[PDB]
Each structure stands twice: as structure tokens, then as C-alpha cells.
Design a protein around this ligand. Structure first.
Ligand SMILES: [Mg+2]
Ligand SMILES: [Mg+2]
Ligand SMILES: [Mg+2]
Ligand SMILES: [Mg+2]
Ligand SMILES: [Mg+2]
Ligand SMILES: [Mg+2]
Ligand SMILES: [Mg+2]
Ligand SMILES: [Mg+2]
Ligand SMILES: [Mg+2]
Ligand SMILES: [Mg+2]
Ligand SMILES: [Mg+2]
Ligand SMILES: [Mg+2]
Ligand SMILES: [Mg+2]
Ligand SMILES: [Mg+2]
Ligand SMILES: [Mg+2]
Ligand SMILES: [Mg+2]
Ligand SMILES: [Mg+2]
Ligand SMILES: [Mg+2]
Ligand SMILES: [Mg+2]
Ligand SMILES: [Mg+2]
Ligand SMILES: [Mg+2]
Ligand SMILES: [Mg+2]
Ligand SMILES: [Mg+2]
Ligand SMILES: [Mg+2]
Ligand SMILES: [Mg+2]
Ligand SMILES: [Mg+2]
Ligand SMILES: [Mg+2]
Ligand SMILES: [Mg+2]
Ligand SMILES: [Zn+2]
Lengths: 96, 108, 127, 130, 74, 50
RNA sequence: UUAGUUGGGCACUCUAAAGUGACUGCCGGUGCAAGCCGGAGGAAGGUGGGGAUGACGUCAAAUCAUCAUGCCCCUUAUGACCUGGGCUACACACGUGCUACAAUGGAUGGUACAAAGGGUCGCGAAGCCGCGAGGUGGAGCCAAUCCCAUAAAACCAUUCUCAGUUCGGAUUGUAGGCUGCAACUCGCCUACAUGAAGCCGGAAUCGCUAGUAAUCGUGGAUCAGCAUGCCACGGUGAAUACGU
């Protein structure tokens, strides 16, 4: 009954966040699953290397985002506020 | 035979493709409305079939009659004065095809 | 209740099970000949079953999904190979000697940043 | 037998092996029908009867390319001569590809063909300036 | 164009000049509008299409159908 | 006119085919993407400092 | 259930965290040795593959306009505000290529499979009126939940004999389709008609050493439309290193 998805460009703006949310739900709620790791997206947006001339040799740059998830429904009042109190740790923003 | 001279040893669809107006598909349909089999040699196109085909193609521009259908329009373009006419009389592309590299098959 | 395994070759993946029977090989719910009409996977998808003297050990229902014509055909083999090994440990030596147990590591590569493909350097003359 | 890998498919420039397999099987079956011998042997007869005495090449003498005799290697000449065989089965105007390959192979088994006399094409040109 | 909306022509050359040449219609016009199309309603009058250098006068004949009001001055 | 090129392709253009995508960091008119609303080159220049 | 469909379940693929793995680690030949050549074991052998990173510096090293700054200048101005400029040619030579004389392929058909972006205007459904392209209408959500999207060329069938031949497709005639205020030069595509050059190519020359060359499609960034260009992705996938 709870859908709190996540997405960030880091393995540390979510891993600690998943640890915290899981700890809060396990202590508070009962019906809960394990940390479900959602997929990742990995771009390639290559460019040109020079200033004006010589466009036959260039480097590439990306912006890759992974995704995390969690879900828990049946619990108690201590887990009622989890979707809003214990959420996104440093570096990211995930909407319940 | 049928408007013009056709080969007498090739398939009818292939044989009927030797007129200025009879191509590869519009003649396949034309020979279909005449109710004649398409994969039989021109030898089997006997007097009955030859008459049927001749009556079939009598309304489709072909042979030297279908040549004034071309030159009248080009002469009209030359008389009108459009850039297409100027290029057609000269050898460059009538369309916008670029002729500072490899435009020779149409101009020598 | 059956011999289990997994497989892969080129860009494919397999999950082949050698369930006991007589030799009716069915690949991803299709006949032994409609899926592979040619003879490409006639011995190749069978030599792993004949890796030991066990051709009729199991009518192995197969499962190949993803990849290519021989990529999946190299995957059914990559599944049957471990199947005989999992059912019987002694089937490992036949896979090792036959040149059939190796996870084929060849795969397609990247594309260079200024070439004309993965390796084909362009053509150009100076004078 | 690497003929499928080196002649049909190698001249089948699409990296296709199925057409090579089909052509090879058809030629072998046609040979085994009319001649009565299995392909395991008659296909071998053309292995060493395709490399000429030497190769055909030009040598620069005093900075000018002149006629001198040079040869190709047991892999270079083997490769170029299997290529010449794939040409010899193809130089004729025979309609069917499999039939053409089978007929050239049978003629080579009978010691004749554009690959049988090709032993002089890369030899006589070099033997004319040895 | 070859679309499903039919003909088109710039209104500056036509609306108050070519569609309004009925009285004392024996003059030409320095029609800088070369985008327009020579519709059948303007047969007889003359428009001076601009080819870049000077507004070249144009004659509207019966066979002019099949060209713009500025395509005869390349 | 170069600093006046933010007034022909930036002012009020009176047609639907009178506006394209220059960059905003540098005023370059060519090679300017819209998924980062910027140009090339200068992404080798801002994506180094940060 | 027409079907992953609905329930059911993490079994399998899958996705992402911590491991394991590969190290001349063992055996043999050579070699005082370093090491070279085999073999084992092993998923891979020998810097596994590929990246990314380009020391000291040469072809007068560029930028005070990214920022800071020393000296020198303007202070009714060198400060602040108000607002308008150049296009595909063709007698020719030259570089990369795409199609071509492709059964390695053609009127049509049955129908296996990638990566990535982004997403609140952002794709945009279906149904829809059409061979092919547009307009009606909109399903889905702040997200592996909703869109672009449909991977097909393969493999497997019909007609054609290597074409001036049922090959090739420019060149033109006609009639259409879209996007775009508007397709005159100067967008692309389709249908009918037309049907050329072009038969493995001189001197010479380019790239390449295994998932590589060759070979067929798919996709993205620029963008209303316009790629045969660039940058990615897989299917099928070889010959050869005598040698300096
Ligand atoms: Mg025709
Ligand atoms: Mg002309
Ligand atoms: Mg054009
Ligand atoms: Mg063209
Ligand atoms: Mg040129
Ligand atoms: Mg030229
Ligand atoms: Mg040229
Ligand atoms: Mg799949
Ligand atoms: Mg082993
Ligand atoms: Mg290079
Ligand atoms: Mg170069
Ligand atoms: Mg040159
Ligand atoms: Mg032949
Ligand atoms: Mg735009
Ligand atoms: Mg710029
Ligand atoms: Mg930089
Ligand atoms: Mg081993
Ligand atoms: Mg480094
Ligand atoms: Mg570098
Ligand atoms: Mg120099
Ligand atoms: Mg500069
Ligand atoms: Mg030249
Ligand atoms: Mg064609
Ligand atoms: Mg198709
Ligand atoms: Mg055409
Ligand atoms: Mg017509
Ligand atoms: Mg696309
Ligand atoms: Mg040397
Ligand atoms: Zn910039």
C-alpha cells in the first residue's frame, strides 16, 4: 500500500538511505520486504574536443542514474509516518 | 501482334512489357482484367487471346502514339519559359539537382 | 527430478533441463526440427547430449531466449553441457576434453571515437 | 576439410556459412551419385593440385619493376590457389552454382580445369623470367 | 505544394491589385512578391517579379498555368 | 553585430519559423543542445570546474 | 486466459551490494639467472578484452573575453539607456565514399530480436477514416508502473539468369502525400509512364591481424521537414604472420 520509489546518480545517496528506511520499517512495521534494487540508466553524450578546428578526434561524457525502491503496507503507527519522516538521505530526492 | 511486335518465346507478362506505356505492373493488371493466364508463353496467346489482349490495350497509350504524350509537355515547358524549360534545353538538371559534381549521365 | 543447468554463448542465455525420457528434444515449446530447420544445431545441439555415451539420457526440454541464430544455438549446448555434469559428476571430464565446457568469452566490441567502426581505420592519401 | 570455410563462404562476402554448407553438401552428393565415390576422398585430390610451381609477381630491378620469379608460401599459395579454385568453379558459364562447383571438382578429379592448368598460370609467368 | 489544401498565393500581390485590376487595366506592377502563385484570375495583367537585380516584368499567357508569378525570371 | 545577435533571434519574432536554440552561457549560434539548454565546448569548460 | 492474462510464487531470467576468480600460482624442456616454449588445473593465460589517463618537449604556443590582477588611459564618456547587413552556379581536376554487372539479390509474404536518453507538455494510445504519408481523438503518470516503439533485415516461399536479359537505377512526363506563413532556384517520400551509363576495372594506392576484416538492419544528438554524414548496437562471421 506504500510506493516510495527512488532514483539518484550515486551508490551512496541511496545505500545509506535504504539502510535507514529498512531499519525504521523493520523496527516499526511488520509486513515488509527486502531492499528491491531497481535498474539503472547509463547515457553516452559525446562532444567535440577542440575549440574550432579539427573535428575528427573527440571525447565523451555521460550522466548515469540508478534507481532504488521499497514497499511495506501492514504495520503500526510507528511505521505510519515512515513514508514522510524517514526518507531520502544526503545527496538525492525520492518521493514516496 | 498487340499494338507492336512482341517476342514469341517469352512469358506473357515479360513479353507484354515492350511498349512505351506497357511496363511491369500496369500491364500485369491490364492483362488481369482480360481474364488471361499470366505465366503462359506468348505462343499460347492464340488468335482468341491475341484479340482479347488487343481489345484490352486499345485504351492505353502505347507505341508511337504514346510519344506525343511526352514531347508536347516538354515543348509546352520550353514555350512557357520556366527554369525547367531552360535547363531541359541546355542539359543541366530540370529539378534542383546540383551540377558542380557528377551530373553527366543527363548532360553528356 | 531432473538435470538442471544454465547456458550462454555470444549474446545469448539459456536455462536447459535434461528431464528423464527418451530423446524428444523440445526447444522453447517447438519441435526439434521446426525451430532449427537447418543442420546447424543438429549435431551441435546434440553433441553435448552425446558428450558422454548418453544420447538418450533425457528428452531435454530447452529454453533459449535472446540473442541470435547460433547464439541461442550455442546456448542450448551451453545448457546441456552442465546438465549431464549436474546429473552425473563424471560427465564433467567429457565436457572438459571435448572443448565444450568453456564459457565462450568472445563478444562484440565498442566503436572508436574517430575511426569508421570498431576497428576499420579510414582511408586517406596525402600527396 | 576447410573448403566450406575458405572457398564458398570466403567468396560469399557476407560472412554467410549456410549457403556455403548447402552448396558444399549439394556438390558432394552430386559427385557421390554420378561418380560413385564419397566426398571424403575426391575433395582431397584438389588440395595439392592447385598451387603452381611458384607464384606470379613483379620485382623492382634498379628501381624499375621487372619480370622476376617469386613464389607464394605454403599458406599464401594455398590460400590464393583455393581462391583460384573458387574462380575455376566460377569462370565457366554454368547456370547452377552447386552444379558448377561439382563439375569443376569432377574435372579436377579427372585432371582438367581452370584450376588444373592454373598450376601454370602462377608458374609459367614466373618460369618465363626465372 | 502537393498537400490536401489546394492552391496558395501571397495576398499582397493579388488581393488589391491582381484581383482588383478591372478598370483601366493596361498597366504593369513592380510586384516584389515572388512567392505568390499566378492564379487563373490574373490572366492578362503584368507583375514585375524581382530576380535579385531588377523587378523583371512578366507576361501572363495561357500556358503560364504551371508556374509562379516569378519563376520565369531566373 | 555579435552582441546584437541576442535581438534578432531573441526579441519578439513575428513568425512560427523565426526562433532556434543558441546557447545561453556563450552566445554561440551553432551546436547548442536543449536537453541541457547549452552549447558544446563550454561543457568541456563548465563540467571541469563543476 | 486469445495471451503474464487474473490470482499465486521468487523457482528461472533479470536487475544491484559484498565476495570468489587469474597470480608464471604448479609440472616439464631450455636457461647459473631473468625469462622463453608447452602441458596441467581452470570460465577465461600469460599487461583476459576494451577503455579512461598522453611524462621531458619540438611546427615565433593561444586566451587580460570565463575569473583575478600590475602598469597605462576615459570621467557630458571609451560609462547607462533606447535597435538594423552577402547563399547550392559549371566548360573542368581532386579527396572520402553509396548504389551498382549482388540467388551474398529483386513485386509481395510467414515472422526469432539492442541501446539509450529524457519525461510533466514529456512522449503521446487505441479506435479511427488510406498501398504508401497527414488531419479526429486521446488512454498513462513527479516513474524498471505512462510514451517515442514498431528491430527488421535473417532463416524461410513464388518470378527472374548476370543481364544492357524479369539487373541497375539516374534522367526526364503525369498525379499525389505530408511538415513547414510559403517547396520557383533549393525538402523528402509514393504510385503510373521512361529506362541510360554501367560486364570484376591501367599505371598506381587504402584499411586491416579474431568476434577482426567482410557482410544487413536497428538507434541516438542537431530538428518543424530535410544524412548516402557522425556517434552507438547486435545477427552471420573468415583467409593469413615464410620473414627483416
Ligand atoms: Mg519498365
Ligand atoms: Mg535535360
Ligand atoms: Mg532532389
Ligand atoms: Mg536525386
Ligand atoms: Mg566531384
Ligand atoms: Mg567535377
Ligand atoms: Mg570524381
Ligand atoms: Mg528478451
Ligand atoms: Mg574444466
Ligand atoms: Mg585512424
Ligand atoms: Mg589519417
Ligand atoms: Mg591523389
Ligand atoms: Mg557461374
Ligand atoms: Mg528549430
Ligand atoms: Mg559554439
Ligand atoms: Mg577544458
Ligand atoms: Mg582443463
Ligand atoms: Mg591516467
Ligand atoms: Mg589524448
Ligand atoms: Mg608542420
Ligand atoms: Mg580563444
Ligand atoms: Mg582522377
Ligand atoms: Mg529495384
Ligand atoms: Mg520485409
Ligand atoms: Mg526517379
Ligand atoms: Mg499516371
Ligand atoms: Mg529515428
Ligand atoms: Mg627492413
Ligand atoms: Zn559555448
Amino acid at each position: 500500500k506504500i510506493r516510495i520509489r527512488l532514483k539518484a546518480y550515486d551508490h551512496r545517496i541511496l545505500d545509506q538511505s535504504a539502510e535507514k528506511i529498512v531499519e525504521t520499517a523493520k523496527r516499526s512495521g511488520a509486513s515488509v520486504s527486502g531492499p528491491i534494487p531497481l535498474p539503472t540508466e547509463k547515457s553516452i553524450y559525446t562532444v567535440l574536443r577542440a575549440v574550432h578546428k579539427y573535428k575528427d578526434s573527440r571525447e565523451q561524457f555521460e550522466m548515469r542514474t540508478h534507481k532504488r525502491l521499497i514497499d511495506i503496507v501492514n504495520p503500526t503507527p510507528q511505521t505510519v509516518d515512515s513514508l514522510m519522516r524517514l526518507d531520502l538521505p544526503s545527496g538525492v530526492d525520492i518521493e514516496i | 501482334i498487340a499494338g507492336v511486335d512482341v517476342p514469341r518465346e517469352k512469358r506473357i507478362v515479360i513479353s507484354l512489357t515492350y511498349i512505351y506505356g506497357i511496363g511491369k505492373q500496369t500491364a500485369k493488371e491490364v492483362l488481369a482484367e482480360a481474364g488471361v493466364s499470366e505465366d503462359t508463353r506468348t505462343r499460347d496467346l492464340t488468335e482468341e487471346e491475341l484479340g482479347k489482349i488487343r481489345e484490352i490495350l486499345d485504351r492505353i497509350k502505347v507505341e508511337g502514339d504514346l510519344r506525343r504524350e511526352v514531347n508536347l509537355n516538354i515543348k509546352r515547358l520550353i514555350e512557357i519559359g520556366s527554369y525547367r524549360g531552360m535547363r531541359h534545353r541546355r542539359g543541366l538538371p530540370v529539378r534542383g539537382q546540383n551540377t558542380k559534381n557528377n551530373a553527366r549521365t543527363r548532360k553528356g | 527430478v531432473q538435470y538442471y543447468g544454465t547456458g550462454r554463448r555470444k549474446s545469448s542465455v539459456a536455462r536447459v533441463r535434461l528431464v528423464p525420457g527418451d530423446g524428444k528434444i523440445v526447444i522453447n515449446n517447438r519441435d526439434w526440427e521446426d525451430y532449427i530447420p537447418f543442420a546447424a544445431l543438429r549435431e551441435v545441439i546434440k553433441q553435448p547430449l552425446v558428450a558422454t555415451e548418453t544420447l538418450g539420457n533425457y528428452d531435454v526440454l530447452v529454453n533459449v531466449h535472446g540473442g541470435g541464430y547460433t547464439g541461442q544455438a550455442g546456448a542450448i549446448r551451453h545448457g546441456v553441457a552442465r546438465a549431464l555434469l549436474q546429473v552425473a559428476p563424471e560427465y564433467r571430464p567429457a565436457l572438459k576434453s571435448a572443448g565444450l565446457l568453456t564459457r565462450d568469452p568472445r563478444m562484440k566490441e565498442r566503436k572508436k571515437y574517430g575511426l569508421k567502426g570498431a576497428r576499420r581505420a579510414p582511408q586517406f592519401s596525402k600527396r | 576439410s576447410k573448403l566450406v570455410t575458405r572457398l564458398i563462404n570466403k567468396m560469399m562476402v557476407d560472412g554467410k556459412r549456410g549457403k556455403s554448407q548447402a552448396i558444399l553438401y549439394s556438390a558432394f552428393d552430386i559427385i557421390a551419385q554420378e561418380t560413385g565415390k564419397d566426398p571424403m576422398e575426391v575433395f582431397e585430390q584438389a588440395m595439392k593440385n592447385i598451387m603452381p610451381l611458384l607464384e606470379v609477381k613483379a620485382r623492382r630491378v634498379g628501381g624499375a619493376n621487372y619480370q622476376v620469379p617469386i613464389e607464394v608460401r605454403a599458406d599464401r599459395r594455398s590460400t590464393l590457389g583455393l581462391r583460384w579454385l573458387v574462380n575455376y568453379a566460377r569462370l565457366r558459364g554454368e547456370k547452377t552454382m552447386e552444379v558448377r562447383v561439382a563439375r569443376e571438382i569432377m574435372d579436377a578429379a579427372n585432371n582438367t580445369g581452370a584450376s588444373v592448368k592454373k598450376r601454370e598460370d602462377t608458374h609459367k609467368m614466373a618460369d618465363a623470367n626465372r | 505544394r502537393s498537400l490536401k489544401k489546394g492552391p496558395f498565393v501571397d495576398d499582397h500581390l493579388m488581393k488589391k491589385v491582381e484581383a482588383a485590376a478591372e478598370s483601366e487595366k493596361k498597366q504593369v506592377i513592380k510586384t516584389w512578391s515572388r512567392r505568390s502563385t499566378i492564379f487563373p484570375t490574373f490572366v492578362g495583367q503584368t507583375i514585375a517579379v524581382y530576380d535579385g537585380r531588377k523587378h523583371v516584368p512578366v507576361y501572363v499567357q495561357e500556358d503560364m498555368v504551371g508556374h509562379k508569378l516569378g519563376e520565369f525570371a531566373p | 553585430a555579435k552582441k546584437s545577435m541576442i535581438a534578432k533571434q531573441k526579441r519578439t519574432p513575428k513568425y512560427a519559423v523565426q526562433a532556434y536554440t543558441r546557447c545561453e552561457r556563450c552566445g554561440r549560434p551553432h551546436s547548442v543542445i536543449r536537453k541541457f539548454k547549452l552549447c558544446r565546448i563550454c561543457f568541456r569548460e563548465l563540467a571541469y570546474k563543476g
